[PDB]
Design an enzyme around this catalytic site. Structure first.
Site, mmCIF file in Angstrom:
data_model
loop_
_atom_site.group_PDB
_atom_site.id
_atom_site.type_symbol
_atom_site.label_atom_id
_atom_site.label_comp_id
_atom_site.label_asym_id
_atom_site.label_seq_id
_atom_site.Cartn_x
_atom_site.Cartn_y
_atom_site.Cartn_z
ATOM 1 N N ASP A 29 -48.428 -56.201 -64.010
ATOM 2 C CA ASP A 29 -48.524 -57.182 -65.083
ATOM 3 C C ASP A 29 -47.128 -57.621 -65.527
ATOM 4 O OD1 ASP A 29 -49.248 -58.032 -68.032
ATOM 5 O OD2 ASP A 29 -51.140 -58.008 -66.960
ATOM 6 N N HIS A 77 -48.429 -57.411 -72.695
ATOM 7 C CA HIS A 77 -49.763 -57.156 -72.164
ATOM 8 C C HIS A 77 -49.804 -55.923 -71.267
ATOM 9 C CE1 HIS A 77 -53.409 -58.045 -69.669
ATOM 10 N NE2 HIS A 77 -53.875 -58.303 -70.886
ATOM 11 N N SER A 119 -59.184 -58.675 -69.126
ATOM 12 C CA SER A 119 -57.981 -57.950 -68.739
ATOM 13 C C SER A 119 -57.849 -56.625 -69.480
ATOM 14 C CB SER A 119 -56.740 -58.804 -68.991
ATOM 15 O OG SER A 119 -56.449 -58.817 -70.363
HETATM 16 N N1 UYQ Z 1 -58.186 -65.281 -61.824
HETATM 17 C C1 UYQ Z 1 -57.409 -64.814 -62.779
HETATM 18 N N2 UYQ Z 1 -57.402 -63.532 -63.099
HETATM 19 N N3 UYQ Z 1 -56.535 -65.663 -63.354
HETATM 20 N N4 UYQ Z 1 -55.567 -65.146 -64.185
HETATM 21 C C2 UYQ Z 1 -54.818 -66.033 -64.716
HETATM 22 C C3 UYQ Z 1 -53.681 -65.674 -65.542
HETATM 23 C C4 UYQ Z 1 -52.998 -66.644 -66.268
HETATM 24 C C5 UYQ Z 1 -51.979 -66.297 -67.137
HETATM 25 C C6 UYQ Z 1 -51.598 -64.969 -67.305
HETATM 26 C C7 UYQ Z 1 -50.499 -64.601 -68.209
HETATM 27 N N5 UYQ Z 1 -50.153 -63.383 -68.367
HETATM 28 N N6 UYQ Z 1 -49.065 -63.163 -69.189
HETATM 29 C C8 UYQ Z 1 -48.698 -61.888 -69.413
HETATM 30 N N7 UYQ Z 1 -49.362 -60.910 -68.835
HETATM 31 N N8 UYQ Z 1 -47.662 -61.641 -70.198
HETATM 32 C C9 UYQ Z 1 -52.285 -63.999 -66.581
HETATM 33 C C10 UYQ Z 1 -53.303 -64.345 -65.711
#
Ligand code: UYQ
Ligand code: UYQ
Ligand code: UYQ
Ligand code: NAG
Ligand code: CA
Ligand code: CA
Ligand code: CA
Ligand code: CL
Ligand code: NA
Ligand code: NA
Ligand code: NA
EC number: 3.4.21.75
Length: 472
Positions: A44, A85, A259
């Site tokens: 992450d 996160h 998540s």
């Molecule tokens: N299929 C999907 N899972 N898509 N995921 C999309 C997506 C988009 C933004 C972020 C931002 N994260 N920012 C952080 N972790 N600081 C993480 C995942």
């Protein structure tokens, strides 16, 4: 054993509950399983390795900074706390117990690391180097990233990342296989359908969705046939959320979304691997199928499959049950080697128009070394053109009558690019005999005069030919 004394443990309702609305983790802890000897890594935005509730379990061998190319995954601090996160997820797995700080991890004696890989440009190479980090030291990986959850994207791992998955499950963990735990997505508000996400749609990832405290499908959830199981997460403002470690040596009660479900699953899998360190990546998925619990999860699509198990596209086989996982793991017999039966279905291209049905009776490689009588994953690998992709809904029916939704209508998906050998995957026929008639349904759900052609349909069956249980 005594239950944790941490100040926020009572607020960790998905662990500490006595009302049967929890993940049954105390029952595993009482069997003596807390994650000792297991190593988990959060892929992450980094990990606050000096957090008072993480430092005691932190493992530099489970950690790296791919974004800046150094060993130290410390997050980048910003006024908005954007990079908090991974620290939240790490504490879900392995926050220290009985130390007067925040709450506890599911596997509060496991070792925990993080890969800082989302805080920068995330290329195929960045993904592959993260998935492939220290694969004979890290046992379990947790991730919740992938293609944009806008409800119009179809994408998955490119070549280096796909190679990392195959190297992980084949040679990782001493040949038992890296366990990739994955969140099924957060695109519910966009009517996203998660088999369009090739990371969660992979057979190599153990995919997890969410349920709210009151047992409902949260606003952010995506339904799809590739999901295996569920853990609790956030819901509406009357429902509690996930309680864990936060950036800047703090404690949060407001961790949310799918998540937050994958790390809880990773923790339960850590407890299970402590109970039997010889489990393979496939063994672990079998345990999840056999032990997960539909009870009190509300959905309108619960259906009984051919071996008597209830399955939902929102929840998979249901809520993870840690006590049952560790119990069944102890004397588990390793599954037989994985067979793969490839059946090319079409003899000619088929016009789709308003509705297409393709029926084919298969022998599932009868007489061959890849003969499968006990299915694990099945894929319908489809190549088709269509003028508006999101008007399509696609179903696959197994010989035992199990109707898997491969694709639901996606109203925002206006793409004219169709599907190019997209391997739509279902877990819902796990342990069925795949011999007999399979049915593929492609339908135009709109009143529009849409048009297109199916040019390839490959049915790919994975599984074995031994070891079946009596149907549930
Ligand atoms: N299929 C999907 N899972 N898509 N995921 C999309 C997506 C988009 C933004 C972020 C931002 N994260 N920012 C952080 N972790 N600081 C993480 C995942
Ligand atoms: N094949 C693929 N489509 N891989 N996608 C990977 C992926 C997608 C979005 C983000 C967003 N991150 N957003 C942030 N860090 N603020 C990170 C990783
Ligand atoms: N958005 C995307 N670009 N996705 N592409 C995905 C994808 C996945 C695997 C491979 C393997 N290729 N292996 C070879 N050519 N020997 C190629 C492409
Ligand atoms: C692990 O499982 C394999 C396959 O069944 C077996 O050959 C091996 O003896 C097992 N090892 C341990 C330590 O249980
Ligand atoms: Ca660094
Ligand atoms: Ca603590
Ligand atoms: Ca999605
Ligand atoms: Cl394969
Ligand atoms: Na998966
Ligand atoms: Na049925
Ligand atoms: Na049959």
């Amino acid at each position: 054993y005594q239950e944790p004394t941490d100040p926020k443990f009572p607020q960790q309702w998905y662990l500490s509950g006595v009302t049967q609305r929890d993940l049954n983790v105390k029952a595993a802890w009482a069997q003596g399983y807390t994650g000792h000897g297991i190593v988990v890594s959060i892929l992450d935005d980094g990990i606050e390795k000096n957090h008072p509730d993480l430092a005691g379990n932190y493992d530099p061998g489970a950690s790296f900074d791919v974004n800046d190319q150094d060993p130290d995954p410390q997050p980048r601090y910003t006024q908005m706390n954007d990079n908090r996160h991974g620290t939240r997820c790490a504490g879900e797995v392995a926050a220290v117990a009985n130390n007067g700080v925040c709450g506890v991890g599911v596997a509060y004696n496991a070792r925990i690391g993080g890969v800082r890989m989302l805080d920068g440009e995330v290329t195929d190479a960045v993904e592959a180097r993260s998935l492939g980090l220290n694969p004979n030291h890290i046992h379990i990986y947790s991730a919740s990233w992938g293609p944009e959850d806008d409800g119009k994207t179809v994408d998955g791992p490119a070549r280096l990342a796909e190679e990392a998955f195959f190297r992980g499950v084949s040679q990782g963990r001493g040949g038992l296989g890296s366990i990739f735990v994955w969140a099924s997505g957060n695109g519910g508000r966009e009517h996203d359908s998660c088999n369009c996400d090739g990371y969660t749609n992979s057979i190599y990832t153990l995919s997890i969705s969410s349920a709210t405290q009151f047992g409902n499908v949260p606003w952010y959830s995506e339904a799809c046939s590739s999901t295996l199981a569920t853990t609790y997460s956030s819901g509406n403002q009357n429902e509690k959320q996930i309680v864990t470690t936060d950036l800047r040596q703090k404690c949060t009660e407001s961790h949310t979304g799918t998540s937050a479900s994958a790390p809880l699953a990773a923790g339960i899998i850590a407890l299970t691997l402590e109970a039997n360190k010889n489990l393979t990546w496939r063994d672990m998925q079998h345990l999840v199928v056999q032990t997960s619990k539909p009870a009190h999860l509300n959905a309108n699509d619960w259906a009984t499959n051919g071996v008597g198990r209830k399955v939902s596209h929102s929840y998979g086989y249901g809520l993870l049950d840690a006590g049952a996982m560790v119990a069944l793991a102890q004397n588990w017999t390793t599954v037989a080697p994985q067979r793969k039966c490839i059946i090319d279905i079409l003899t000619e291209p088929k016009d789709i128009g308003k509705r297409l049905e393709v029926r084919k009776t298969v022998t599932a490689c009868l007489g061959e070394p890849n003969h499968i009588t006990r299915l694990e994953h099945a894929q319908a690998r489809l190549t088709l053109s269509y003028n508006r992709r999101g008007d399509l809904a696609i179903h696959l029916v197994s010989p035992m009558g199990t109707r898997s939704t491969l694709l639901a209508a996606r109203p925002h998906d206006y793409s004219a690019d169709g599907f190019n050998d997209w391997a739509f995957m279902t877990t819902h026929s796990w342990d069925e005999d795949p011999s007999g008639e399979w049915v593929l349904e492609i339908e135009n759900t709109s009143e529009a005069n849409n048009y297109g052609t199916l040019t390839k349909f490959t049915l790919v069956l994975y599984g074995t030919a031994s070891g079946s249980l009596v149907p549930r």
